[PDB]
Write a protein that binds this DNA or RNA. Structure first.
Ligand SMILES: O=C(O)CCC(=O)C(=O)O
Ligand SMILES: [Mn+2]
Length: 201
DNA sequence: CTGTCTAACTGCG
DNA sequence: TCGCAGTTAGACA
């Protein structure tokens, strides 16, 4: 309850803190201890004709048989684990929404980042929201309008994502706006992000 | 065969 | 420290 509502032209989102420091610290430790990340061949993507190692670590968990694909990289979900189930069920019991898949991004520090994109693929249940839960260091998250890089120019939306926070990205946000987690060199500590989604069978 | 798009980078300013 | 400009060991419709 008591969400901060992020609203603009074709942008509907909401931000809330889910946990206090003591709890979120406990979940963060467990994530650090328990999550396994893809390496080598499953850590490379194809963008602008070139193959790049990703500047971060990624993991996927979810219901058996599923798959997710972005930028010429196809990831297969590992079976659920308690710490992840715990978070999922908490987000479910607060939003009403259900989820069968989570992508985990770990930025060891402000050098690690994700370039701007739309969480795009049609393998994603249409109309469904995306649940972004963040642990560890606060990191600036940035929204930017599609046609703004620039015919008619809507203002960029900056937002800090805190320890134990939840960002909800409701439809139609992801058709209209791009998002990135830009480099911040002042940031020395790790951060783990869990974006929960609903995937089609 | 044309045009729209790119979850990433270097090399700047 | 930040982020813009210009992408392209090109994909795809
Ligand atoms: O790091 C985040 O806050 C979200 C990362 C992201 O954009 C994604 O999981 O696709
Ligand atoms: Mn994303």
């Amino acid at each position: 309850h008591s969400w901060r509502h992020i609203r603009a032209e074709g942008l509907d989102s909401s931000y809330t803190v889910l946990f206090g420091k003591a709890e979120a610290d406990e979940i963060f430790q467990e994530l650090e201890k328990e999550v396994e990340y893809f390496t080598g061949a499953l850590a490379r993507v194809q963008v602008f004709g070139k193959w790049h190692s990703v500047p971060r670590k990624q993991a996927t968990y979810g219901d058996a048989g599923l798959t997710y694909t972005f930028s010429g990289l196809t990831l297969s979900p590992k079976p659920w684990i308690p710490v992840l189930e715990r978070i999922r069920d908490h987000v479910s019991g607060v939003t009403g929404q259900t989820f069968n898949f989570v992508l985990i991004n770990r930025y060891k520090d402000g050098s690690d980042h994700i370039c701007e994109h739309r969480d795009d693929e049609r393998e994603l249940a249409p109309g469904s929201p995306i649940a972004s839960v963040s642990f560890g260091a606060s990191r600036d998250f940035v929204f930017r309008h599609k046609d703004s890089r620039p015919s008619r120019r809507v203002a960029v939306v900056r937002l800090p994502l805190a320890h134990g926070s939840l960002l909800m990205m409701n439809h139609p946000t992801n058709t209209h706006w791009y998002h990135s987690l830009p480099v911040r060199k002042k940031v020395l500590a790790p951060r783990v992000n869990l974006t929960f989604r609903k995937i089609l069978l």
